[PDB]
Structures are given as C-alpha cells and as structure tokens.
Amino acid sequence: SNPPPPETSNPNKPKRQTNQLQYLLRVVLKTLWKHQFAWPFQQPVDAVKLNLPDYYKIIKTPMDMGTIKKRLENNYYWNAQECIQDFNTMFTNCYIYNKPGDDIVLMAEALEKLFLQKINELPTEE
Numbered sequence: 408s409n410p411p412p413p414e415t416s417n418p419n420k421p422k423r424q425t426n427q428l429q430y431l432l433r434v435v436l437k438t439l440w441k442h443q444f445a446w447p448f449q450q451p452v453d454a455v456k457l458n459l460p461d462y463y464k465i466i467k468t469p470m471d472m473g474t475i476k477k478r479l480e481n482n483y484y485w486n487a488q489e490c491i492q493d494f495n496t497m498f499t500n501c502y503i504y505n506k507p508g509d510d511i512v513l514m515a516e517a518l519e520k521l522f523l524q525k526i527n528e529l530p531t532e533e
C-alpha cells in the first residue's frame with residue numbers, strides 16, 4: 408500500500424503570503440509544472456501502480472510537485488525556505504531511490520537545472 412500523502416492543510420500551522428512565496432508559485436512551480444518532464448513529479452509516487460514495493464521502505468520523507476502546488480495554493484507555508492526544501496527533498500528522493508542515468512534521474516536533473524536558475528533570482532523580501 409501507499410502511505411498517506413504529505414500534509415497540505417493544517418489550520419493551526421501559522422502561515423504567510425510573501426513576495427518570495429508568490430515567486431515560488433508564479434515562477435518556480437509554474438516553470439517546472441509545464442515542462443515536458445514534469446509528469447512523474449506531479450503527484451505522490453504511487454508505489455502500487457508503479458510496482459515499486461520498496462519505494463517507501465527507502466524514502467521516508469516523500470515529496471512531489473502536486474503536494475508543493477497544493478501547499479503554495481493553500482498558503483501552507485510560513486517562508487520560502489520551507490518550499491525550497493520541499494523541492495530539494497523531491498529531487499534528492501529521486502536521486503537516492505533510482506540509478507544514475509535512469510530516465511527519471513535525467514528528468515529530475517532537467518527540472519532541477521530550471522529550479523536552480525529561478526531560485527538564483529529569488530527576489531529580496533518585501
């Protein structure tokens with residue numbers, strides 16, 4: 408079976424809408440989401456459908472852009488660092504689970520290159 412997804416709603420978690428978080432949605436998430444290689448990363452890994460019964464034995468902090476998109480659209484975060492960390496967890500999980508040179512790793516690398524380019528120009532806080 409699959410684990411429950413990461414949390415995307417938590418009314419008692421303090422949250423903010425900031426210009427950096429707006430950039431993370433409007434620039435970073437949108438750029439990666441529309442990319443031809445986004446699809447494996449647009450929702451939690453379905454270890455049942457994909458026949459990866461060891462996935463959640465190895466990956467204990469799952470993350471995906473569907474979760475990140477919901478967190479941004481629901482104003483789940485307090486700061487940009489928390490969202491940046493989610494993206495990096497997603498990429499790292501992919502590199503940890505898979506073998507070098509696998510298609511999925513090349514896909515992650517292409518998305519990560521764009522991510523790094525956009526993060527390099529994260530606006531200063533208002």
Ligand SMILES: COC(=O)C[C@H]1CC(=O)N(C)C1
Pocket residue numbers: 446447448452457500501504505511
């Ligand atoms: C469509 O799913 C794939 O192509 C590979 C799996 C495993 C992995 O790390 N993912 C992000 C999904």
